[PDB]
Ligand binder design. Structure first.
Ligand SMILES: Nc1cc(Br)ccn1
Ligand SMILES: Nc1cc(Br)ccn1
Ligand SMILES: Nc1cc(Br)ccn1
Lengths: 287, 259
């Protein structure tokens, strides 16, 4: 079954177990393999994998990681993925002193949005967008990955799992524990990610839910009904040069992504027009 | 607002329509099953309705389950004594897909009265996944309904309830309802309910969205008008039972129109 794959090295661990880089002995294709242990006497195939696999089989966009195969055994499941050099977080870290050029930022954000818009157009929420889950190659691409915390939504949305999105990237309507959330939460995350590519530090690095709330308020302005109609009624509500290097258009897009009100928060579709991406190119990254 | 994904509501509808064809069961599958029948499938679906109420599952979970079953029996000969094993495994799969807090496997074994072992359930799980090639994201009657509800004005509790009742009654009878697409059944269920509680038809705004007229929806509306009329005489009662409760505003207690 995996007779044709040769293990090269471990590249990370996720919900499931271990992700490895491997090579197809017969084709030379370098791949990433995700080993998922099956609970054959207890809880069977994890729902994480049921969602990841079923949703990735539908999404075939140049900015969504490609699942090339699913190799079954009695006891193990291997997901075969296309290999991407690294994740945005490692790249950011590599670039903390040099910086990431503005053209490449622009390109990465453009792609991320094209990817994400495809998700939304196909009733899928990602719900875990953070730099560690975004993969880049050496030819200047970026792609959404790790769709284990993803959900196929209905219209209108109903109540989904609340424990969603790493704290730092978690939108205010999840924090405050609102009953319903939707495609807006992914945009928030991307907005947090835009900011991070520009500064190479995270925008809202909280130690707790309460700290996270305070971190947002002080930056975007204590939300009020005039800015976020409803903020005061939200279940857990209670009594600039954010990015120096960034142009006038940049700052406009960012605010629209980081809007408090999920209804007023820009869609991925809208954002793909924002003047910021009028001169977008596809630079190669320095790595 | 954003909970109705305004900038995507259309692309999503179009996608679901394209996908409801790909996830469509074989209309003739039961005549090619040497050992099982439409009637046995009736018992199976009826039993799944009951399980969804004891475990308080989403109705959407029930629809997926039935999709999983029809696609599985569209590809695999199954003997009667295993028909329940397939259905239990589908419900389990639909729960893992759709529910925030799915029942554990042990509860899926408990409901079969230990007709089957845990190993069998879990093995059948894997087989169902392989046969469906992990395509679990099937559009359902409900996914069309919840969209079709947003074209009411005002919103109506009883019409929404009543539409779901009819939708679920369709899941029980392969004949005729396998030869209709979910989007269609959904539309036929919406009209019938609107009329019954208000006197109003399939609205115009939905005709523009779907390309479906009352004329094109007549066959299904007929079959379904019958089902509603014969509902108290149907050998399977679990849905009626279920919709006689406040949660669904006893829409099962309502007398259907005449024509
Ligand atoms: N059997 C295997 C497993 C991995 Br991981 C890589 C190659 N072969
Ligand atoms: N390096 C990687 C990891 C995954 Br998961 C997918 C693609 N490339
Ligand atoms: N033995 C059985 C099988 C089903 Br399906 C429902 C009830 N009892």
């Amino acid at each position: 079954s995996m007779e044709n794959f040769q293990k090269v090295e471990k590249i990370g661990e996720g919900t499931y177990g271990v992700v490895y880089k491997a090579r197809n002995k017969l084709t030379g294709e370098v791949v990433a393999l995700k080993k998922i242990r099956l609970d054959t006497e207890t809880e069977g195939v994890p729902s994480t994998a049921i969602r990841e696999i079923s949703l990735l089989k539908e999404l075939n966009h140049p900015n969504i990681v490609k699942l090339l195969d699913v190799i079954h055994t009695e006891n193990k499941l291997y997901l075969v993925f296309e290999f991407l050099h690294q994740d945005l977080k490692k790249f950011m870290d590599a670039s903390a002193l040099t910086g990431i050029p503005l053209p490449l930022i622009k390109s990465y954000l453009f792609q991320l949005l094209q990817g994400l818009a495809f998700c939304h157009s196909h009733r899928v929420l990602h719900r875990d967008l953070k730099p560690q889950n975004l993969l880049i190659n050496t030819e200047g691409a970026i792609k959404l990955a790790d769709f284990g915390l993803a959900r196929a939504f209905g219209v209108p949305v109903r109540t989904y799992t609340h424990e969603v999105v790493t704290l730092w990237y978690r939108a205010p309507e999840i924090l405050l524990g609102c009953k319903y959330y939707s495609t807006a939460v992914d945009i928030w995350s991307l907005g947090c990610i835009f900011a991070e590519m520009v500064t190479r530090r995270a925008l809202f690095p909280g130690d707790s839910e309460i700290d996270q709330l305070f971190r947002i308020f002080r930056t975007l302005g204590t939300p009020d009904e005039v800015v976020w109609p409803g903020v005061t009624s939200m279940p857990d509500y209670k009594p600039s040069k954010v990015v120096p290097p960034l142009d006038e258009d940049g700052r406009s897009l960012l605010s629209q992504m980081l809007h408090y009100d999920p209804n007023k928060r820009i869609s991925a579709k809208a954002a793909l027009a924002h003047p910021f991406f009028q001169d977008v190119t596809k630079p190669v990254p320095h790595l | 607002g954003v909970n109705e994904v305004p900038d995507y509501h259309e692309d999503i509808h179009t996608y679901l329509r394209e996908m409801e064809v790909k996830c469509k069961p074989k209309v003739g599958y039961m005549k090619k099953q040497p050992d099982i029948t439409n009637s046995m499938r009736a018992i199976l679906v009826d039993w799944l309705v009951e399980v969804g109420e004891e475990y308080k599952l989403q109705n959407e979970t029930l629809h997926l389950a039935v999709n999983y079953i029809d696609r599985f029996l569209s590809s695999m000969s199954v003997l009667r004594g295993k028909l329940q094993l397939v259905g239990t495994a589908a419900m389990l799969l639909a729960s893992k897909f759709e529910e925030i807090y799915p029942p554990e496997v042990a509860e899926f074994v408990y409901i079969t009265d230990d007709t089957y072992t845990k190993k069998q359930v879990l093995r059948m799980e894997h087989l169902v996944l392989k046969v469906l090639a992990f395509d679990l994201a099937a559009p359902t009657i409900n996914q069309f309904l919840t969209q079709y509800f947003l074209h009411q004005q005002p919103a109506n509790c009883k019409v929404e309830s009543l539409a779901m009742f009819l939708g679920e009654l369709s899941l029980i009878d392969a004949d005729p309802y396998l030869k209709y697409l979910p989007s269609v059944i959904a539309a036929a269920a919406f009209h019938l309910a609107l009329y019954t509680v208000t006197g109003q038809s399939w609205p115009e705004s939905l005709v523009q969205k779907t390309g479906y007229t009352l004329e094109t929806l007549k066959p299904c509306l007929l079959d379904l008008h019958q089902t509603y009329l014969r509902a108290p005489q149907h050998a399977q009662q679990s849905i009626r039972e279920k919709y006689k409760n406040s949660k669904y505003h006893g829409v099962s207690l309502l007398n259907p129109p005449e024509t």
